[PDB]
Amino acid sequence: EIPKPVAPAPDILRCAYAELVVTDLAKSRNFYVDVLGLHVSYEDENQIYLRSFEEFIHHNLVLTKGPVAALKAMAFRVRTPEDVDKAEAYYQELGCRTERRKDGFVKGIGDALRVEDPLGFPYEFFFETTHVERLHMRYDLYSAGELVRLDHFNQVTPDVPRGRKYLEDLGFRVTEDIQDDEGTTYAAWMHRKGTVEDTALTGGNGPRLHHVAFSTHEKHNIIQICDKMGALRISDRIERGPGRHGVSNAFYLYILDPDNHRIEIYTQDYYTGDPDNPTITWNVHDNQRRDWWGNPVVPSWYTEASKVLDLDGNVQEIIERTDDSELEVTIGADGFSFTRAGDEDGSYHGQASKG
Amino acid sequence: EIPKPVAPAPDILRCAYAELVVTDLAKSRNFYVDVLGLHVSYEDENQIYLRSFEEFIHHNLVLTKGPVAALKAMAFRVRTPEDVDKAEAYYQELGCRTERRKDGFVKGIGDALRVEDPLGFPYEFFFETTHVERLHMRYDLYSAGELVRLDHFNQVTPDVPRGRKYLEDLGFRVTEDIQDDEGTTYAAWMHRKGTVEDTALTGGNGPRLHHVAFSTHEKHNIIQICDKMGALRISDRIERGPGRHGVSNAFYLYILDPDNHRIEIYTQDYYTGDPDNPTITWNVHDNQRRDWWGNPVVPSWYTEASKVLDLDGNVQEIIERTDDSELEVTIGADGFSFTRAGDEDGSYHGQAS
Amino acid sequence: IPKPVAPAPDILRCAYAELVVTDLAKSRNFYVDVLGLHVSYEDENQIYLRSFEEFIHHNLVLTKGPVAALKAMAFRVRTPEDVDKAEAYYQELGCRTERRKDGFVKGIGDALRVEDPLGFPYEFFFETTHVERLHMRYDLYSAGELVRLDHFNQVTPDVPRGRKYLEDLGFRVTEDIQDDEGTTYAAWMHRKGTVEDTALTGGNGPRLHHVAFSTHEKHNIIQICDKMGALRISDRIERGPGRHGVSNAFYLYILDPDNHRIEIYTQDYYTGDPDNPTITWNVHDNQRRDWWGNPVVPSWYTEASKVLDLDGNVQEIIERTDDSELEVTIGADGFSFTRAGDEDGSYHGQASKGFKLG
Amino acid sequence: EIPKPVAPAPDILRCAYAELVVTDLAKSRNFYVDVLGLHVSYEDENQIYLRSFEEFIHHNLVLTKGPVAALKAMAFRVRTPEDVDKAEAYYQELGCRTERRKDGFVKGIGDALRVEDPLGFPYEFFFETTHVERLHMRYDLYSAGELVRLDHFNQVTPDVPRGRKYLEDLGFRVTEDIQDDEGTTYAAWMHRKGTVEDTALTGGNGPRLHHVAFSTHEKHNIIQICDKMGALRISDRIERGPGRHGVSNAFYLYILDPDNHRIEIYTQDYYTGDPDNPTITWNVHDNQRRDWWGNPVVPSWYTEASKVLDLDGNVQEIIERTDDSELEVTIGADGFSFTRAGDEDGSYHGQASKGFKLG
Ligand SMILES: O=[N+]([O-])c1ccc(O)c(O)c1
Ligand SMILES: [Ca+2]
Ligand SMILES: [Cl-]
Ligand SMILES: [Cl-]
């Protein structure tokens, strides 16, 4: 278990950006800019800095050309410049490796702290960032599939309770989780900004990055991304969805970038900012928990996820989950799920829902 | 081949209603009224008569209590009263069994002809119907999942070219179909009213009714039906979708009523009313033909469909398809499909997507 | 206007309009760059445009000329022989006709243009060059995509006279607006089984009130508004967005660079049954035009496009003598109601929502 | 100028509910429940307690029968029980009248402080509230016009800068405002919860309550409210809209309840939770600032607003605005508005946009 520092936690505002290492910057540009319509804040031959429609900070996504596709940093913005000092002291007390650069690691970010966190993930904390033109009323640019905000990250980690306690001490509040009747936790969602999540934990071998999620305004915007992918004859890069989530109540879609980094498109979850916000726990065998309509979750959603880097840019070693596998217990050969608790009718034994 | 009668074909306007036999009227009522929000035009202890939001004829759906769930009649409205006489002469010349009721078979329909058609389906033709309040601006009644029009029927039949030619002789025009390079036809869609379909043929064992389809105004109305079914903890009755179709380009959902009658919810196909409307043929192995997003088609969608009745109310015997099976050639052990033709990447062999 | 002995042509639908525009590049910016229509052909003289779901060559031809005006409103007929029928029909009416075996505009074949009994330049054609139907080209689809041509709307001084003539041509009236003392202010009529393929608005005419395109959904119309705000051309949004009473469609009216009015429209209802119930609204009903009761801007009633004769000269305008919809509803002696018979929610001598005429 | 207290400001989470006095409880219930679809948490012969689709606290709106329709309280939830004490101390230091009820003023609220604030408005601060069933996935109940959240209040007050500074000291951050080139502020918007607004100030005679705002998921939900009001033949109760706002970038509608309390329906503003969120200032003469599409702002929007009560339940006296009037300077006789700054084309002199004048 991860101890609670004496040192005060930094005041974290929200998830702010991810830096993803990609192998072919032009193929990645085509996906994120031409297919998905993200806005270029800055680009050169090594990196593309992208932002969503409503963002005013420099970027929400940094694509960095490199030899091995992986997450290099998941960044959270903190409330004040002095919260970057707080973050540094906090992670030092945790005995984590840290690195601080007063002029930032990427363009458009100033004084920033990167850490290898207790779960093996590269977190950044920053306040200072270069403001850019907020494009929120640039309806002359607005795409039928427009991505309007960065919403969250999702992390694969082998021991969810261990990770949950650490994130709670950091000030994240759990909104929803998935457990069973035998004391296992399979997933948890937690926030700072008053939505269902800024980050989330999915039980599995880790550290790996499960996905980065962007918001749309409306459900038809997500439908348009699917339709466009069909027209481009790249429907094979649609992994799962579109659907309605149980957990989060959001309308969603999962797609795969050219290096198989998973992107979620997400809309219309609910407000969580009250400190006694009711926590919702789903049973792992409830077939409406992930897709509310009961559509089956493809095995790749559970098994595939991106590598993460340490502060030297090397791939973090993967530690195997020993807790029960959500895949195995719901859709594996001895799996089970139900539509109605206690009802044999609409239940699934050793197979996924819908045939 | 079904010969073309010398007698003139009835001028068919559109699909108008289906009469479905149901086993438990109250359970059916709960599904079609409380879950789906159809509007009651009449009911008693034996039948419920229902219509969509924008309809002015008496009904689009009749639920009739009976011992065996089945399609009892798929009804088309014809342009004039004389077209019912034309229908009678046409089907008589085809050698089909017919029954004429000058005062109708169901309430709110007048002079009507029912036939056991050459594919074994119970068709009704009528002009006369009781007009009711058109609810198209009754936004005080409008549901988040509102069903606004009856759009089409879909019939399972073993020989699609045989059925197609018969429907063409009746004035239906084919808009889209699915074929392979070997020359097999797997499915065809055909219309009178200037949308992609009023009826459609799915290759399979028949006669069986594949589904009845209703439209919504917008895609979010279809999403809401799914969301409602999740809240009612009946998500197991969502069979397939929601999706974008390849064929028709419509946004769609398939759901199952208490007797396993399949209902499609549909929106935003295209105009087909010009007589040289371009006909679109998809290859059966194209994994974007049925769901444009490449989502797999569950086997039950190909194998399960409703019984149909003859004019005595007995179940029509089924004839097995001898042409190749769409299920088998796409998702069965020897099947395949592609995302991009000639590309093994994004292709599926012996396996769905 | 007498019913000919000659049979009417079988009209399928409205198909395209040819608009004369004064600055081709400025018009192109509006129809292509702002509105997203798709180019079938263009040169220094003309731009040929189609909607997202169209397979015929075009829905709109922009023709450079000295005086902005409607040059032709074109209806597609069912067969080649229907063009001959249209020629015989209009000749029996005593109208000036001109037949070109190879068309008046590119991508149309054998075509008949007529100066009709109301002064309007109608075209009838069957033959047209098919193009790529873009209906699944979601790689092109804009947030404001115009998906079909829906209808025309004509300003004419005597609505019943026009209505009777269109009925003889096979159009069926769906909705109209009347008062209690026998004046008709507007009528809507169709061939293709929607509310309208053309429509008559009482006023000085012949003038073209608007051409209408459809979207898939209501949000697509909202986006057009939003885009016009971002482009700082909100002054070219004339009226809306709204819900119509008549037609029940969601709508918007915008103005092109020559003040030609374009309606964007969605989700009217099916009218293809021959006994489709007609709907008559009282002119004083403040929900008849905008169902939400929003006021109808006076320019909507007063302004419309010139139309040309077959020589390309402007048709002389004839004044309406029947009562004016503007005057009887929102003028200083006008009135409208929310609930018939109820003084609460009624407006006298001004428009709804607290405005009077500017 | 309202001084900054030495005492620490309470930590405010969000706007939480309004209590409105209504004259005919059954008529008001018809509007809020039968027309708008809000969910009943409790009712009796005297009050109706209502909540939105996604709410878990007891209510977002209390309708209280009384002789004079008015705003009785605009309630903000605070982060901890101790923040109610901080609120009491803060407002006492400001010299404001306060009333503390350990078991609440209304049902489903616990320990609560009501205050006559320095602008004359009845504010409530509370933490304790009865949780109820959160209906966020009850799609069996979901209306085509569903109101999903309470979003904000908007207050009419004569001196906007004075109010703005007081709210900033209380920890609200201004997201957008409307000013001119002569030093006048006409309106300001300010938040705690990380949306454009939890409350907002509109220049005019006050204190009066301009509106309470609820959100929908999507724009079509707002369209449906309008459609339904047409079907119910109460389109006269649609005051303004629907539209796209300039300020907030939200899609919006204003409607009027049976006592002429104004309700806004709103959707799809943007995130403001970063502390250096860029403040957007619109010029008062920009004809896209209130309605982005340039539609004219109905004069009642500027002139009409609800009475507010003091802690005794008496109506607060109105103080006249002496700063320039937004109505007068934009759509009045000597008014002016533009579409494009510096362009005469698309400008309006002494009248409203789109061909209208003041009635
Ligand atoms: O592409 N298909 O699966 C189709 C297309 C249209 C239909 O109405 C349908 O039921 C199936
Ligand atoms: Ca000035
Ligand atoms: Cl999920
Ligand atoms: Cl109108």
Ligand SMILES: [Cl-]
């Ligand atoms: Cl405003």
Ligand SMILES: [Fe+2]
């Ligand atoms: Fe996620």
Ligand SMILES: [Fe+2]
């Ligand atoms: Fe179908």
Ligand SMILES: [Fe+2]
């Ligand atoms: Fe129109």
Ligand SMILES: [Fe+2]
């Ligand atoms: Fe507001």
